[PDB]
RNA sequence: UCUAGAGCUAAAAUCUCGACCCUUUGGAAGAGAUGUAUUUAUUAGAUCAAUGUCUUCGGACUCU
């Protein structure tokens, strides 16, 4: 999947293409919040520690903050309708993996930092 | 007309009381007294004048 990566002390955002299934297992089963070292999924991310924020599924449904059931279930949603809601935890089904980087460590991102 | 995360833009015045002073347009010291809505309970929401009448011509009487 996608890293949607975003810098807000310089407030850059980029997105990465992951295909290795090495690099996206360290992310499986946490939950938008925790604290994530990139150090295990790239020797270039070496000391990043990184929060997950967000994202979407493979169907534009998107990770609602901490409801959550890593399926997807329906919602009484905001007057009200219901639509249909993925969990708040990460699983394998994800289009992308949008993210905020927290400590920067050593090495650099041309265009992110 | 689906969505994600990021950085921005106390004082008041009026009411009554008036010590008094002053004769004319009269004028005043100080003595006090007063929230709006809402809610329940409590509180308020016999007489006088004569023209009647009597009289002793001074006045008395409210029976009509």
């Given at each position: ?55 979407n599924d493979k169907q534009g449904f998107p990770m609602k ?7 997807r ?10 639509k249909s809601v993925r969990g ?26």
């Amino acid at each position: 999947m996608k890293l949607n990566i975003s810098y807000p002390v310089n407030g850059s955002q980029k997105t990465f293409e992951i295909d290795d299934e090495h690099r996206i297992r360290v992310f499986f089963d946490k939950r938008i919040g925790q604290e994530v070292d990139g150090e295990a999924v790239g020797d270039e991310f070496k000391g990043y520690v990184f929060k997950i924020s967000g994202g979407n599924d493979k169907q534009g449904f998107p990770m609602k903050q901490g409801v959550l059931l890593p399926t997807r279930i329906k919602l009484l949603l905001t007057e009200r309708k219901r639509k249909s809601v993925r969990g708040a935890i990460v699983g394998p089904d994800l289009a992308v993996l949008a993210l905020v980087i927290v400590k920067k460590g050593e090495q650099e991102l041309e265009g992110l930092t």
